[PDB]
Enzyme design. Structure first.
Site, PDB file in Angstrom:
ATOM      1  N   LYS A  69      -4.479  21.377  32.954  1.00  0.00           N
ATOM      2  CA  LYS A  69      -5.530  20.936  33.829  1.00  0.00           C
ATOM      3  C   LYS A  69      -4.947  20.003  34.930  1.00  0.00           C
ATOM      4  CE  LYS A  69      -9.214  21.308  30.142  1.00  0.00           C
ATOM      5  NZ  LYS A  69     -10.355  21.867  31.078  1.00  0.00           N
ATOM      6  N   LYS A 103     -21.089  22.415  37.492  1.00  0.00           N
ATOM      7  CA  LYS A 103     -21.954  21.253  37.525  1.00  0.00           C
ATOM      8  C   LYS A 103     -21.927  20.492  38.872  1.00  0.00           C
ATOM      9  CE  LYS A 103     -20.722  21.154  32.707  1.00  0.00           C
ATOM     10  NZ  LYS A 103     -20.263  20.353  31.550  1.00  0.00           N
ATOM     11  N   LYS A 109     -12.792  16.062  32.416  1.00  0.00           N
ATOM     12  CA  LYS A 109     -12.532  17.234  31.556  1.00  0.00           C
ATOM     13  C   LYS A 109     -11.548  16.805  30.454  1.00  0.00           C
ATOM     14  CE  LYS A 109     -10.771  20.026  34.745  1.00  0.00           C
ATOM     15  NZ  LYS A 109     -11.947  20.318  35.449  1.00  0.00           N
ATOM     16  N   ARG A 110     -11.396  17.615  29.411  1.00  0.00           N
ATOM     17  CA  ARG A 110     -10.421  17.200  28.397  1.00  0.00           C
ATOM     18  C   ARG A 110      -9.017  17.057  29.066  1.00  0.00           C
ATOM     19  NH1 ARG A 110     -11.980  17.400  22.708  1.00  0.00           N
ATOM     20  NH2 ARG A 110      -9.785  16.958  22.436  1.00  0.00           N
ATOM     21  N   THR A 166     -16.506  25.111  33.655  1.00  0.00           N
ATOM     22  CA  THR A 166     -17.949  25.034  33.862  1.00  0.00           C
ATOM     23  C   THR A 166     -18.348  23.728  34.480  1.00  0.00           C
ATOM     24  OG1 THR A 166     -18.220  24.389  31.634  1.00  0.00           O
ATOM     25  CG2 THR A 166     -18.590  26.637  32.184  1.00  0.00           C
ATOM     26  N   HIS A 173     -11.906  33.039  25.342  1.00  0.00           N
ATOM     27  CA  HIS A 173     -12.032  31.915  26.271  1.00  0.00           C
ATOM     28  C   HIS A 173     -10.692  31.316  26.749  1.00  0.00           C
ATOM     29  CE1 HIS A 173     -16.401  31.086  25.445  1.00  0.00           C
ATOM     30  NE2 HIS A 173     -16.100  31.649  24.284  1.00  0.00           N
TER      31      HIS A 173
HETATM   32  C1  LIG Z   1      -9.066  29.789  19.576  1.00  0.00           C
HETATM   33  C2  LIG Z   1     -10.186  29.190  20.490  1.00  0.00           C
HETATM   34  C3  LIG Z   1      -9.507  28.089  21.303  1.00  0.00           C
HETATM   35  C4  LIG Z   1     -10.305  27.584  22.483  1.00  0.00           C
HETATM   36  C5  LIG Z   1     -10.402  28.279  23.629  1.00  0.00           C
HETATM   37  C6  LIG Z   1     -11.091  27.479  24.465  1.00  0.00           C
HETATM   38  C7  LIG Z   1     -11.548  27.612  25.705  1.00  0.00           C
HETATM   39  N1  LIG Z   1     -12.298  26.520  26.229  1.00  0.00           N
HETATM   40  C8  LIG Z   1     -12.902  26.597  27.572  1.00  0.00           C
HETATM   41  O1  LIG Z   1     -14.088  27.464  27.396  1.00  0.00           O
HETATM   42  C9  LIG Z   1     -14.885  27.281  28.548  1.00  0.00           C
HETATM   43  C10 LIG Z   1     -16.102  28.142  28.201  1.00  0.00           C
HETATM   44  O2  LIG Z   1     -15.852  29.557  28.430  1.00  0.00           O
HETATM   45  C11 LIG Z   1     -14.100  27.746  29.862  1.00  0.00           C
HETATM   46  O3  LIG Z   1     -14.846  27.438  31.062  1.00  0.00           O
HETATM   47  C12 LIG Z   1     -12.740  27.045  29.983  1.00  0.00           C
HETATM   48  O4  LIG Z   1     -12.009  27.621  31.000  1.00  0.00           O
HETATM   49  C13 LIG Z   1     -11.978  27.151  28.628  1.00  0.00           C
HETATM   50  O5  LIG Z   1     -10.724  26.471  28.596  1.00  0.00           O
HETATM   51  C14 LIG Z   1     -12.535  25.383  25.504  1.00  0.00           C
HETATM   52  O6  LIG Z   1     -13.202  24.434  25.928  1.00  0.00           O
HETATM   53  N2  LIG Z   1     -11.986  25.263  24.248  1.00  0.00           N
HETATM   54  C15 LIG Z   1     -11.643  26.491  23.615  1.00  0.00           C
HETATM   55  O7  LIG Z   1     -10.621  26.260  22.724  1.00  0.00           O
END
Ligand SMILES: CCCc1cc2cn([C@@H]3O[C@H](CO)[C@@H](O)[C@H](O)[C@H]3O)c(=O)nc2o1
Ligand SMILES: CCCc1cc2cn([C@@H]3O[C@H](CO)[C@@H](O)[C@H](O)[C@H]3O)c(=O)nc2o1
Lengths: 810, 810
Positions: A548, A654, A542-543, A650, A351
């Site tokens: 971002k 929405k 968003k966070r 995502t 992700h």
């Molecule tokens: C080691 C794991 C770390 C991690 C990856 C990552 C990705 N995303 C988000 O995951 C969402 C779901 O795929 C995407 O739409 C966003 O672009 C992405 O930033 C997220 O919300 N938080 C996760 O933390």
């Protein structure tokens, strides 16, 4: 009242009413003269839950008889939000309960507001897991969500003097009516100990034992009578634990701390032991349950025909060595056969490509906490590196780049490399993100095994993200095209034949106006704030992360302010600019951005010259239930990450679905959104991925933009000189310094093109009718972004199972 | 089946059956093919609880309208045991549920065995609190039990190699269906901080806040439709608590540890801070609730007409300074008026005269934790010492003996002195115990205020302690005299006219034989142990303490063994000697006694010469539900504490009521028991109180008994030389040494008279018919020992309220 909410039959209403009173009396032990709204909410929650259980028991029974292949979705995050309304929607009880509660003299909507969010996730990744469970249930897959029952979810955000304060999210204080404890299915999980070699193989001994107790929460499909299960483990001490007698009892908390709290650091990795314990705990309790369910169906050859395990990023990457461990050490399969089974069972979704987000666990940690799993990992690495050696002979650099083991200061395991080696499929989450994985961070692995790499573009569930939160838009859609699009979102294309329809035009715009009115009033009632609902509602939620680029939004906002001050008597399209999102508690920069945002609001919102032409609001405690309210109310969706950094997004989906137009970069799924609606129906600006790469090669010099852009220089000087912080003139020196000397995300390079594209938006906004026709063209092409589409692609191309829209019997 | 268990009407049975299925389906979310016996137990527990709530809600409503004076019973211990059967008994549902569950193909008795004990107490004092709640509900008093919801109750006892091991009593693992969380009534409790003096009086500031959340458990009266409330507080952290973000969340456990675990040290005081926190927590949350209920009825003059607070020993002695604190600091009454109200509100019951059992808190503790309460205590002391000075002028020694403040090494507050000063009544718990308080430890206080001192001899509830545990005895009684004695135990006197009745004789003996058969079988099924049910069942069950002299029992047992070995072929009345009870975890001597008991069993139970003539069993994990089983099965009740040490005892009363004869000393309530049955119907031996005093004056020399008693010397030599510990010959050197040189309880002085009186018992036992007529004479005079009698005396002579046997409407 409205048709998509179902029938209020007189039998149903009368039945709901009496079950409500029964629960009030028997379950809550209250009578009507003492009940508070919270008692009423519980009584309704209990009444609606009674409709689930019949269906829950028979869905589980049906899977026992038919024995289909089972999907296990492993995630450390399930960002569920509220369950009451979603449950009503999927069961078609919504109008009936509205009617039943009105007759008792209650307002259902007021009762819905009382439910706490289940905030068991941080943002996109956890919410994806929630949309997926919904889609899985709707498509009739025999699917189970597995995670951790955190006692505290993501923190509640309070702003004091414009700073984030965090406070504990005590979401269980009053009880959770949706869950059923199953202490009868408790399972042991092991930690520490050592490895002993016998004649009869390796043995893991002298372990500490933590118990994993499951809680089951029902997941109803849309009107199909399917009810799947989400199983979340809680940590419990065993009874002979430590066994001051007193101190021994009190130290039971050390074990139970494993499930106490969700880690709030999303896009930055911290290698803390408690975190590794959480990862192993969910993976060990889950695999035992999986293997147990499988054995009630010796021959592990059939295991991959009966089990799929999906890894939601590398958080449960230990499923791989753990499945090896059980197969080799406990069931006595030989290595190669256990490996075949593992690879054919597991699949991995990535992700992010941000380097500091990737999990890289110190070997001294795994060695102490999981010493057998480290041995298994070394063995996996060695066999893997021998396939690499044999396919690229003499390429010693490939060998070190591909190793699961990173050499250096401290040795680390690269968990991503482990998932790719041990999975039959690896997917990214939007087309461009999947291409980047193939060209950059996983290039080597792709050259070794091109057949593993796939794309599965993300989606959102139209049940929560349209029907639930935006009943008025769902309704005018259903008037023209019927109700079938709710489980087949591609049908929204039929809306294109209404783009020149005068009545539809006025109705789409009327719904937007209503959502804005309602949201303006939510702002005043619950946070004393005065907004013009005739302004364009410009939203970025968003966070908070540098990638971002909330900062780029900040710059546009300040530019608009400076332009008004320069020519006060000139007409500008008024805007309400709302920005919201939580910052990770130790992410200093993210905390400073929140502080700048509120500081800009302090200046702009109190300038009498500005009037009601520009407002800047920071939306406190953004979370799923706040998203259900603000997204329907938005006109403009800000998706403005630097090209190449947002894997998918995502939220973007929405807003497209709910009638806002999108300003953003060609990043993540924005690219597929524009391609579905047409580039003319989207506000695209800024560097593409290729331009960012060209800029890194030559070097990014921010000074260059500051020298050539008088409007930018003015903003920088204001920031530095204390214009926005009169009492601490140098409050923002870190931000300016970062922008000037080490901006990994190139805020200034996109600034000019962003300001320009923002004028194109204001111009369209001035012509209501053409704004609305563009809205209609977005909503109508939003079908691809349904998580039903997403899940049907995982089902067919990764899991080897066929979706099905067929009702089970009632 | 049996008549005292009520009607199985066909409407009732059919109703129970369907509610059972409803709960199985809806509450448990199981179907009949997956349910385990634990699911069935829950379904029945939920079905029976449904019968309480109607009655619960209207009892609370009735108290709102009638506004009677309210009784608050404050205790840190409520030793409740199981709730299912008790609830059935009091609601007259027992036969109906037996019938309903039989028709579903279930055995109700097997389901009852599944319920965990609520072990929220250590022994006599906590169980008294439980009998009291029952009696209060049966007598229609508007009464509330207030305590702490411990997460772990008294530990489960496991014996390994003859040693006590303790393991955590995790009584909530599976849920508690009887309780209702009331998080809406949560209240703040303060700790630490400092005292500030304003113009407007003293103020307590900079406190840490712990939240107290109440759980309500229903307390049904006997067949009168009254349902009172037991409210137990649980500790919760506030949300801004500590507020690593992570570490801050995990440190919430420090606050919640307050209600985590019950302290298992009964008859020895330990001044640990966590213990003082538990005492303040229950007292602060409770007084706020009390004052809140009172205000919904400014004028505190009426407070004592509307509130009585009973202190169950000094554990909640802080109610006194806390009530002053609220009245003076928060409501602004002047001192003298606040004091009048306090004294007229509070009453104190003492339960022991053992010096090391009395609470004496270090001043440095109170100073840090409760600095305002210490100021209030100093002020109470000063005003109190001025009344003493003025009534006994010049008696400076009286002044230091009576001070609330003990001088010395470390200064201490004497909590007992505080209760006497701040209460309008002080009572002991048996006639002789109340006389001793007046002649010894409280002599000074009695001379100051003779009118405060009363006796209220303890009692036990005949619902649990006859009807519930001994249905067959209750039944043969009810055949002759009806059912009315269940709430009026004095009616058992009518049984005296059956003492020469041949049929009654055979029936009393048949019931005893049946209880013994059943209990012999419980021993085999659940702990693999072989007993002759034709032996006299000689039982000593109670916490392990030197004063209770399990050691004297040990000596008798060894004597019997040595007599058999000496003359193997001589006839002796066979006995099963059973001893059970838990030891406090740090009480080394108590742990050694348990070890001796099992070591004697290892020798005696395996001597082929002994045969089945003598068995010695240690009953593991003695607790309330084990008491319900062994007490009906007993022939001989051992109550053999050194005269002057057992304040009352209540086990003694359980056995008298259930048809065992009593061997004991003139201690505690044994004196009133003998006086009610006649000294001829009781086996009294040993020093009286006066003889113990004569012996202390001259000095107790144990050597003297050892030199003059050849049978004693032999036992001592066996103990020393390793007869009972072949592999560690010196295992028992501490015991022998204690017996020889520092026995505060004079085991040897009572030895001869005890062995002799034990021969009188064996002789009576040889003549079944005369044994039984003596039993009948005991059971028939046991009426005084009903806790209904006890509570009606507290009601009339301390609380100022009239009991009432009137039904509330159904
Ligand atoms: C080691 C794991 C770390 C991690 C990856 C990552 C990705 N995303 C988000 O995951 C969402 C779901 O795929 C995407 O739409 C966003 O672009 C992405 O930033 C997220 O919300 N938080 C996760 O933390
Ligand atoms: C500081 C408080 C310490 C404390 C006193 C005390 C008394 N008792 C028992 O309380 C029972 C109830 O009154 C009596 O029958 C027994 O004789 C008595 O030993 C008890 O079980 N535990 C209590 O510990």
């Amino acid at each position: 009242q409205i048709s998509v909410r179902g029938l209020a039959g007189v039998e149903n209403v009368t039945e709901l009413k009496k079950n409500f009173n029964r629960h009030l009396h028997f379950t809550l032990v209250k009578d009507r003269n003492v009940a508070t709204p919270r008692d009423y909410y519980f009584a309704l929650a209990h009444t609606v839950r009674d409709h689930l259980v019949g269906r829950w028991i028979r869905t589980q029974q049906h899977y026992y008889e038919k024995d289909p292949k089972r999907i296990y979705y492993l995630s450390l995050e399930f960002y569920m939000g509220r369950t009451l309304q979603n449950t009503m929607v999927n069961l078609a009880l919504e109008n009936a309960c509205d009617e039943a509660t009105y007759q008792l003299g209650l307002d259902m909507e007021e009762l819905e507001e009382i439910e706490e969010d289940a905030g068991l996730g941080n943002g996109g990744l956890g919410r994806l897991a929630a949309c997926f469970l919904d889609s899985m249930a709707t498509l009739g897959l025999a699917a189970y969500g597995y995670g951790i029952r955190y006692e505290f979810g993501i923190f509640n955000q309070k702003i004091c003097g414009g700073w984030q304060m965090e406070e504990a999210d005590d979401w269980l204080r009053y009880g959770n009516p949706w869950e059923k404890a199953r202490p009868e299915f408790t399972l042991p999980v092991h930690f520490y100990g050592r490895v002993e070699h016998t004649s009869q193989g390796a043995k893991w001994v002298d372990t500490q034992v933590v118990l994993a107790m499951p809680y089951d929460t029902p997941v109803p499909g849309y009107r199909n009578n399917v009810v799947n299960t989400m199983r979340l483990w809680s940590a419990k001490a065993p009874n002979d634990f430590n066994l001051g007698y007193i101190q021994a009892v009190l130290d039971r908390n050390l074990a139970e701390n494993i499930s106490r709290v969700l880690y709030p650091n999303d896009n930055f990795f911290e290698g803390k032991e408690l975190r590794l314990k959480q990862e192993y705990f969910v993976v060990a309790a889950t695999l035992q349950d999986i293997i147990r369910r499988f054995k009630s169906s010796t021959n592990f050859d059939a295991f991959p025909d009966k089990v799929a395990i999906q890894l939601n990023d590398t958080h449960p990457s230990l499923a791989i060595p753990e499945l090896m461990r059980v197969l080799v050490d406990l069931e006595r399969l030989d290595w190669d056969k256990a490996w075949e089974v593992t690879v054919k069972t597991c699949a991995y979704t990535n992700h992010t490509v941000l380097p500091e987000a990737l999990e890289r666990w110190p070997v001294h940690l795994l060695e102490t906490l999981l010493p057998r799993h480290l041995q298994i990992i070394y063995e996996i690495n060695q066999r893997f590196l021998n396939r690499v050696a044999a396919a690229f002979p003499g390429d010693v650099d490939r060998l070190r780049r591909m190793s699961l083991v990173e050499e250096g200061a401290v040795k680390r395991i690269n968990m991503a490399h482990l998932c790719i080696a041990g999975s039959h499929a690896v997917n990214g989450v939007a087309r461009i993100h999947s291409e980047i994985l193939k060209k950059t961070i996983f290039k080597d692995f792709y050259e070794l095994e091109p057949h593993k790499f796939q794309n599965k573009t993300n989606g959102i569930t139209p049940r929560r993200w349209l029907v639930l939160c935006n009943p008025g838009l769902a309704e005018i859609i259903a008037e023209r095209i019927g109700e079938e699009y709710i489980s087949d979102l591609d049908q929204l294309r039929k809306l294109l034949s209404y783009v020149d329809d005068e009545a539809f035009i006025r109705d789409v715009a009327k719904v937007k106006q209503e959502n804005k009115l309602k949201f303006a009033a939510y702002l005043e009632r619950e946070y004393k704030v005065h907004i013009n609902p005739n302004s364009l509602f410009d939203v970025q939620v968003k966070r908070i992360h540098e990638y971002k680029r909330q900062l780029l939004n900040c710059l546009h906002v300040i530019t608009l302010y400076n332009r008004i001050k320069k020519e006060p008597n000139k007409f500008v399209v008024p805007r309400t600019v709302m920005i919201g999102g939580k910052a990770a508690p130790g992410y200093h920069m993210a905390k400073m951005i929140i502080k700048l945002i509120t500081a800009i609001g302090d200046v702009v919102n109190h300038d009498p010259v500005v009037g009601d032409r520009l407002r800047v609001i920071f939306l406190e405690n953004y979370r799923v239930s706040l998203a259900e309210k603000v997204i329907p109310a938005a006109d403009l969706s800000e998706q403005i990450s630097t090209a190449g950094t947002e894997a998918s997004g995502t939220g973007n989906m929405k807003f497209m679905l709910n009638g806002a137009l999108t300003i953003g970069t060609m990043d993540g799924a924005n690219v597929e959104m524009a391609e579905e609606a047409g580039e003319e129906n989207f506000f695209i600006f800024g560097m593409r991925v290729e331009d960012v790469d060209r800029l890194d090669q030559r070097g990014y010099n921010a000074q260059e933009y500051y020298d050539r852009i008088p409007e930018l220089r003015q903003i920088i000087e204001q920031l530095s000189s204390g214009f926005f912080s009169p009492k601490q003139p140098d409050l923002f020196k870190d931000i300016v310094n970062m922008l000037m000397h080490h901006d990994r995300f190139k805020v200034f390079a996109d600034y000019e093109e962003y300001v320009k594209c923002q004028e194109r938006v204001s111009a369209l906004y001035k012509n209501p009718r053409e704004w609305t026709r563009m809205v209609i063209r977005n909503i109508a092409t939003s079908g691809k972004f349904s998580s039903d589409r997403t899940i049907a692609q995982y089902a067919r191309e990764i899991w080897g199972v066929e979706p099905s829209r067929q009702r089970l019997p009632a």
